[PDB]
Design a protein around this ligand. Structure first.
Ligand SMILES: CC1=C[C@H]2O[C@@H]3[C@H](O)C[C@](C)([C@]24CO[C@@]1(O)[C@H]4O)[C@]3(O)CSC[C@H](NC(=O)CC[C@H](N)C(=O)O)C(=O)NCC(=O)O
Ligand SMILES: CC1=C[C@H]2O[C@@H]3[C@H](O)C[C@](C)([C@]24CO[C@@]1(O)[C@H]4O)[C@]3(O)CSC[C@H](NC(=O)CC[C@H](N)C(=O)O)C(=O)NCC(=O)O
Ligand SMILES: CC1=C[C@H]2O[C@@H]3[C@H](O)C[C@](C)([C@]24CO[C@@]1(O)[C@H]4O)[C@]3(O)CSC[C@H](N)C(=O)O
Ligand code: NA
Ligand code: NA
Ligand code: NA
Ligand code: NA
Ligand code: NA
Ligand code: NA
Ligand code: NA
Ligand code: NA
Lengths: 207, 212
């Protein structure tokens, strides 16, 4: 398609890029990376970090899921809806919660063991507040349609579901964070999301 | 037209915001926060993280230095030069190197500052950033070209904190012998009037570092 994703099926960072491409309806070639013996194309395309996702558009590689999400938004502006808000302030809000998901939630969630689990439920509690304040009674961070923040968090949903099914816990417990519980179901049930969301059972085996 | 910056004189993250405002020529109110006893305005403006910088433009706060730089770029468009490249690819390169400075260089120099292992990672990251400069600059003085751009400000924000460390240690982080492009860059960016106007006294930074 002249759009190539260097991927790994179990990565939430790769799932972010798949979700962004799917929501717009941009076609792409998926290439599965073996991260134990990395491809020539991966090592040439991301020489500094050697991680997936990499998006290659028209010979030019793009690295880091949040950078890729923004790239997609700028380069495919005329194809399907935008993830980023139109106005500077709304964009600043979206990038803030993007930074928080990666800098706070993922630092804690990857670390989660007891002490890490204290930080995870604190970060989830904050994200319940983010959703109430961003959404304004609408289903998503982006409003009536899924936006940047929804994709950054939505990318981690299968990872979160697998973790939950292993432990016997709900990260998005309806008793504690009802808005996030409903959001996981609403985002999860989008046709564009269901088309790329990996089987949870398969994730569990991998981990 | 009200720009208030909730700052701390020793923060490289704050100095990023000052650099961007200075390079554009946007006026702002600098407010020095005490991070030991945080103000009511800081606690209300950044309720989730309680960190400086916060930029308040017409009553609306913005948090996280890299987010703030991009906001200024979007909100003050055609006041002075833009920090971000025009084309999506060049912006993706600029955002990549921004993420690398925060995620790799700063993570390593904090681990160095709290020793050999961290010194391996700092040297490694500076080496990589020599390559970023060669590839980004295209024979011009800066990452953003003939004028400073986003990457120059993200790295430029750490120059005071680098120079104090270097002053106390007797070492160059941007050593001419090992990263000559970065050494020339540090001198070029540091000699800009817009940079010089907000660059803290090294001697006061030395003392502050020495306390920690
Ligand atoms: C929350 C969470 C989920 C897990 O998902 C995958 C797996 O289940 C374990 C794993 C380590 C973690 C464990 O915790 C995780 O944070 C994560 O890291 C995982 O491999 C990560 S994905 C492969 C990885 N890529 C990135 O890190 C990209 C990050 C980049 N900032 C982006 O945004 O583009 C890579 O390529 N590593 C190099 C190599 O493996 O050789
Ligand atoms: C390289 C480096 C320099 C030092 O600079 C300042 C000081 O010299 C010591 C200090 C801790 C370090 C020590 O090593 C440093 O990494 C950093 O950590 C320092 O206080 C940091 S600035 C104040 C801090 N802000 C942020 O962290 C914002 C980051 C955010 N991602 C952004 O981008 O907005 C805050 O507001 N903290 C709240 C509280 O103090 O309660
Ligand atoms: C007296 C002060 C002046 C003022 O100058 C610059 C700017 O306008 C805001 C700033 C933070 C201050 C705020 O009050 C200050 O103390 C200083 O901290 C500043 O970036 C300092 S850089 C330059 C100078 N070498 C220094 O270190 O003083
Ligand atoms: Na952070
Ligand atoms: Na909010
Ligand atoms: Na909408
Ligand atoms: Na300039
Ligand atoms: Na606020
Ligand atoms: Na960035
Ligand atoms: Na990084
Ligand atoms: Na300039």
């Amino acid at each position: 398609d002249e759009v190539k994703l260097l991927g790994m099926w179990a990565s939430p960072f790769v799932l972010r890029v798949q979700l962004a491409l799917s929501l717009k309806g941009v076609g792409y070639e998926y290439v599965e990376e073996d991260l134990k013996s990395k491809s020539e194309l991966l090592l040439k395309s991301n020489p500094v970090l050697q991680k997936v996702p990499v998006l290659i558009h028209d010979g030019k590689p793009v690295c880091e899921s949040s950078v890729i999400l923004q790239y997609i938004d700028e380069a495919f502006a005329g194809v399907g809806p935008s993830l980023l808000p139109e106005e500077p302030h709304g964009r600043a809000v979206a990038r803030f919660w993007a930074a928080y998901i990666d800098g706070t939630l993922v630092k804690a969630s990857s670390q989660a063991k007891a002490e890490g689990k204290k930080q995870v439920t604190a970060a989830v509690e904050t994200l319940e507040g983010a959703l109430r304040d961003c959404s304004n009674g609408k289903p998503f961070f982006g409003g009536d349609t899924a936006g940047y923040v929804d994709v950054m968090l939505g990318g981690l949903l299968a990872w979160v579901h697998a973790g939950d099914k292993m432990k016997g816990v709900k990260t998005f417990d309806p008793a504690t964070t009802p808005l996030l519980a409903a959001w996981a179901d609403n985002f999860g049930s989008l046709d564009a999301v269901e088309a790329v969301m990996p089987d949870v059972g398969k994730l569990v085996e991998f981990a």
